[PDB]
Subunit: 461 residues, 4 copies
């Protein structure tokens, strides 16, 4: 009689299990780790708080951690990203999970709290796995005593790493962390190619709009913006790219994109006069990818072409001034996570009004909100890194170390390149790719071991 | 009465000057450096030994250094890469240059020595600009006393940087260097997009082969191999990629390439039996991009499809076992830098034999050997970095330090990210791109200064 | 009003919301609605319609109605209905018999409910068909009804083939317009529609990464061309099979390796003829041919473990699914997604690794596992349908003297001038601006400034 | 003692022959016709006037017609399209050819005349092969008596076909013609894919400009415009497309291009006010592809961005108003077939003026003028069709019919689909493609013969 969970519909469990069994065949690096370490049980004694999108892919990560000996308590890190059949299958396996698609903000907080508390008292957690830093933030602000027992944080995504680095800079980070994002088999796989697969996927499921021949503006051209621009361009959109980083803008130009600013001369003075109204009046689709605040602002929303689609694929919804739209314009739900925003006014709308925007996932991460996020074979790389980072920090046992040794180890680190390569090798074999072996003379010639690592730590790929 | 040069044909100078004037309009970063620094003359007193392909683009580099106060003596770093109209225009401007297309190895060594020796004695050089490390090697081995007076080396390319780091670890490097290669506006501009532009260019000029629908094998998937693979795929080739680095192989898979090895199970035991004969007998074009030795070896060459094209776009011709082909097979020159290599024997050939390979540029860098290398607007980035690096090491005056101080200063460094971004900004403006400026609130939100730098040094782009 | 059968009438409001959006995506269709509503050119038309009951078909239906027609509608595929579209049409008072997931028997029942009203043949006088099933039932089972019918407007390649065989045999009883071969249909819908919707359906069904994986597309006509591009743009390594060497030449020039599932291309019915090495490397096979058994039993036995199998041609007999029902065990993953266990027929190991994934039980995959073509592409096809319906209805074939009937009993396409007028409205929908020839320029190339701009021989 | 030719340099013949031998291995359909028909000499007694770009590819066509029994007298159909080594190799083989790169207009006419006249009298020609209709026109206008002996014309290109169809409409065409252009293995191969290969090739050879990230305007989107647009887009240009045909414009939208007009509201009223100045002011490259007159007019040239490249890949140079530019602006030759046009006036130019355009090949066919036109493997399809068309008409012997029978036989027709398919099969096999054979049951199912043809004649591919 297991009841230590909360999900939308437990009867979806059999369906979730069927898709988990498929996903395992799409995840050779993660499953290779499961088979490699199952006998050693390197996570025996680990008690992991996890906060990441409760998808089928996260399901395979959860069961790998458990198979290596960990206990876990799990929530999603976004209100719309849970796949309810994934959550059901995890709960039906006797694993505490608190997640459903379509949580309210209040419910989202409650779900994180259900992982932190067991039977009304703080759980004796000793490890954290996080995506975006929400669970990390709640622990440091509301449950600081628990961090006295926690050996480390393994953080999934660019935004959460930024939050960790700010805490470290400020002296407020209480436990060490591994930046899982900046493994090459994560950042340059998940962040870029994941969004390539899943951005156009989400726009199609939400609107079924033809994309070919239409105009797109992508705000940002980091890993997520590069992959997002590709997602649209490969469908035949005419893509323009905005950037504040001239190196990233240089890449956009060389990649065949016109680089433009929403603001005249690139200068936002906060008034409508600084908006490039002619440019925005021609845009059919705007996608924010920055990790920054208010990069699709109210004046931009006022100027967009009628019936433009607006969405965000960065971690948080404040990339888009949705608060402005809630205050001033009338929202018509088309179907879950698809809203028409009628720019004619606040109090009601004409069902046949033509002056509206279409907002996807209420500005939340659109690939997870309106589709299923990244595919299993991409998340394979990210979640193999997650498992290796959990093992490394749990084995280090930071919480047990004397104070002077803790001080040596209070940092935010990445996994060694050798492990990055071993993850990548299993991914390549999943495609049937064959990696060539250096001869001894060739390895000597370029100064590497036949076994790698093959690049210096400075290398950017 | 200027005679301090050696070029193919001085009457080509007018043509070269016409193309330099065009190249100037395509190189806004370099020309902005001219405008900003000409009055300050930051290279007054600099005496630069330069060794880099004597192209039109290098001409704009040379005249920028001169305009900023330097004296130079120049040679090419490859026997086939000079553009004779560029060499003549430089010589006609009264600048010492020793370079022509189609040098012999002996003539190549002689041309570097004419830069080192003025009127039969060592020139009082104090700066070095190099591409591949050949001039750097000759100074260290044959003219070590000249390095006592030299403040620095600015090294252009990956292979050259590797040779500098080898000297550094072995204690044999005598002066500090700036690794120009690893600016992002160099490595992820020049090395990649430059080869994208110029690889298919050179193959068309040399053979005029249709590439669409034919089978290519690219050896390597670093920056050069990435750009080379794109060069061929965008023409419609079916491109397969070989790699020893699993992370680079993972990128090739995700980029939509099949990853294969010339060797059964990737195991290169040196026998004919290890060659995947079925694979190589399907290949119409093989391109080496590795910076490594013998990656298109004798047994691969024996197995290639009849009439396959063989070429190299890494720095040195030993990527391909051309020595084996010289010893065993008969060479028929089609035209300069295009040879049919008849696998029927050494003593002569049937003019209508069908069993031959086509080798481009005798295995030397094919984009420079059979076309004109990278275009001006791409080399703008590389050569703006070269000029900033020359100013930086010349201002630092390493040669004037005491022995104790030199030891603490001897290093291989990259330019700071702020300068990398400033180069990028000028390139983007050259495309008409408009970079957005952060608001103060946005800059505070992501933790950067509004003027940049916008990324931590760990960032890979 | 009860003259309908849909899955769930309460989905009507949602369907109406999506119709209002689709109208903004269909400028050609809505321009026709606006130009002709006053003249009511379809007043008196009674149209039997058999085509995928999607949101896009809904806008087509309501354009016909807005021009004066009455209609009775069914879907031409058991899996292609969008239930919210069908509910919206039924809620508008329009007879529609269609839901997602019909059995074959329900499929036939639905078409019969359009043909019969109150248990006797409806007084139909026009037909709109997609694939020829409704056309075939009328000729075989209700030939008297064709006495009153002025024509058929047929949507798709397979349906046109069937019309041309009847005309050659002398069994076609009413004239037809081949809507498929308008350029704004064939070279828009058949190609770019599959480009948009094939990778869409495979992602919805499996959520598989496609980049880096190996695909085999069988056929390189308009659907194979668009299908190949749908996969290649995702980063698949796509190989193409063809029996037509001209289409094969295009596949080569477009950057694809052209291969055959059979050694030297010879399909002699033996396992020995299968290129097992080739098929053992394929992660995805898509059939696009309109032919029979082009992914046969022996190919299915030879495919790489866990390969995805689907069909985007009109009919499911492109794949030998009957063989798979007879011999292997089907595990439903979710609706229209089945694991087919090649370990035997009775039962399966839930952790078996030797299975295929079949999408939509071999039926049209873009419609079965996603929503088919997007509104802005279907705008072109369905504007041609409206013009074709108008033309044949105005011609009044069933009312002509027999000598006039004999002169008009044929299968035709719409004139090129109308094809250009549909395209112009599509281009304006993108914000494109077409340039007007000057008089000197028109004279130089020998066209009217108004068009048509190409001879009828032109292939685009 | 063979002197019946005129070429630039007969000593280039050995080089021409090496390239011909390579070309033969790239042209399997054409070489297969040599083998299939050599024994039967189907062209014995044929005397062919040939007028088509005197390239290496035309050399293989010429020697195929001779290998099947024909005599020929040849000229080029453009003043810049000849490869002088091809012309030399043909002359040295004893074949009358009159063609060199860089002819004047007067020399161009003289060369056609030398094919028509032998020893000062009309040659006893009985077949015509033409590219663009210039030879056809001269025959009909100046030598009409010769057409009483000619069995037919085989015309290569769209513009020539239009000129034939005009004559047929007016009743002035004197002999029947094969429209070679409209074989699928010609129009959808040569016109489209040939320009894909060779347009960016010629722009690189002429300017060495980076194309990635720059703005192009392509006028026309028929077969040449489709292939030209792809040539630029695949290099990373941002390509805009103009059309007068809404169906073709629809295809450009769906192919991912923005469709624009040089004129406001698309209305070309001949004034400067009609020009979309903001559009033209941002274009780096304009390419005319139409076969129409003055589609890049004087007001467009005045409005173009400084230093834009201007070129034409349609058959005739009047697509561009170069006459306006000769009459008003100063031309500066960069190198052969590359001119800077200084918009500062007619009376000289400043060597450092920035207000110029770059014109390639003086407005003539840019792929043939600045590079080598289409590659051998593409011209294989076109010229295999030419050979079959020559046999077809020659074996039908129109010139021997009475006038009343000629009238019924006079037509402009395409080759039957069966021959088109047979050419295509040979092209596919040259790539190593394997075509599948229908079973009897499948052939019956779709209503075709196992041997084909596989499509109705209405099919558009
Ligand atoms: N939805 C997903 O599946 C997914 C996956 C990975 C990461 N993410 C999230 O996406 C966001 C971006 O991640 P990333 O890895 O690409 O980070 P990144 O740093 O590589 O890229 C962000 C880019 O935004 C640019 N930018 C910032 N402010 C801008 C502005 N005002 N205008 C234009 N450009 C601006 C920056 O210059 C930078 O290049 C983060 O929130 C990250 O956590 C989402
Ligand atoms: N021609 C040009 O214009 C040009 C431009 C820049 C650099 N280069 C030269 O190109 C070479 C490569 O430069 P880079 O910047 O790409 O270096 P890189 O280190 O980024 O890439 C070289 C790649 O080769 C791979 N490799 C090594 N041995 C291999 C083998 N046996 N088989 C397969 N792959 C193997 C490595 O794993 C690596 O990824 C260097 O010589 C560099 O100087 C040439
Ligand atoms: N799903 C959709 O939305 C959609 C859209 C339009 C048409 N269709 C259907 O798709 C099918 C194809 O339509 P089309 O317009 O592309 O037809 P098409 O005639 O243009 O193409 C079919 C191609 O298949 C090839 N082929 C035939 N038998 C083959 C075999 N055994 N192996 C390999 N290739 C073979 C033919 O040579 C031909 O080129 C028809 O059934 C049509 O009605 C589906
Ligand atoms: N250079 C080459 O190698 C090569 C190869 C084949 C053909 N050609 C020549 O190229 C030209 C085009 O041939 P094609 O086969 O593409 O013909 P096409 O009829 O298929 O296409 C020309 C297109 O130009 C469009 N057009 C006409 N006037 C226009 C205007 N004012 N503005 C915009 N678009 C306009 C027409 O609508 C048409 O679609 C002809 O002269 C042909 O002989 C050149
Ligand atoms: N499918 C997925 N599961 C978990 N985290 C993700 N981030 C992006 N896609 C994801
Ligand atoms: N055009 C060029 N000039 C100088 N060095 C180069 N390296 C690559 N291309 C080059
Ligand atoms: K997923
Ligand atoms: K160059
Ligand atoms: K749809
Ligand atoms: K050529």
């Amino acid at each position: 009689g297991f009841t230590d969970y909360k999900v939308a519909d437990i009867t979806l469990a059999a369906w979730g299990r069927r898709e988990l069994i498929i996903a395992e065949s799409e995840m050779p690096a993660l499953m290779g780790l499961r088979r490699k370490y199952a006998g050693q049980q390197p996570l025996k004694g680990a008690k992991i708080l996890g906060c990441i999108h409760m998808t089928i892919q996260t399901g395979v990560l959860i069961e790998t951690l458990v198979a290596l000996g960990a206990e876990v308590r799990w929530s999603s890190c976004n209100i719309f990203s849970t796949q309810d059949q994934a959550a059901a299958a995890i709960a039906a396996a006797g694993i505490p999970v608190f997640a459903w698609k379509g949580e309210t903000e209040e419910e989202y907080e409650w779900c994180i709290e259900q992982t932190i508390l067991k039977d009304g008292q703080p759980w004796d957690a000793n490890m954290v796995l996080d995506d975006g830093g929400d669970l990390t933030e709640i622990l440091h602000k509301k449950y600081p005593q628990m961090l006295e027992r926690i050996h480390g944080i393994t953080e999934e995504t660019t935004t959460g790493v930024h939050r960790l680095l700010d805490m470290l800079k400020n002296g407020t980070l209480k436990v060490p962390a591994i930046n899982v994002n900046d493994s090459v088999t994560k950042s340059k796989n998940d962040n870029k190619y994941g969004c390539r697969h899943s951005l156009n996927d989400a726009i199609k499921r939400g609107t079924d709009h033809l994309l070919s021949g239409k105009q797109a503006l992508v705000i940002g051209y980091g890993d997520v913006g590069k992959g997002s621009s590709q997602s649209l361009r490969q469908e035949g959109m005419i893509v323009k790219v905005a950037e504040v980083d001239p190196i990233c803008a240089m890449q956009a130009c060389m990649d065949g994109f016109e680089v433009v600013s929403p603001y005249k001369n690139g200068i936002n003075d906060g008034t409508e006069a600084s908006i490039d109204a002619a440019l925005l009046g021609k845009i059919d689709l705007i996608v924010t990818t920055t990790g920054n605040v208010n990069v699709c602002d109210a004046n931009m929303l006022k100027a967009l072409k009628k019936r433009a689609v607006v969405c965000n694929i960065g971690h948080f919804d404040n990339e888009i001034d949705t608060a402005f739209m809630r205050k001033n314009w009338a929202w018509e739900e088309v179907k879950p996570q698809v809203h028409k925003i009628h720019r004619t006014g606040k109090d009601g709308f004409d069902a046949h009004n033509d002056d509206y925007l279409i907002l996807l996932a209420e500005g939340r991460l659109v690939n997870l909100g309106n589709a299923t996020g990244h595919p299993s074979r991409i998340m394979d790389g990210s979640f193999a890194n997650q498992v290796l980072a959990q093992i490394h920090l749990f084995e280090q046992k930071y919480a047990d170390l004397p104070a002077a040794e803790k001080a040596k180890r209070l940092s935010v680190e990445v996994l060694p390149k050798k492990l990055d390569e071993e993850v990548a090798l299993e991914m390549v074999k999943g495609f049937g790719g064959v990696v060539t072996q250096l001869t001894p003379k060739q390895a000597e010639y370029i100064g590497v071991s036949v076994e790698g690592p093959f690049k210096p730590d400075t290398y950017r790929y």
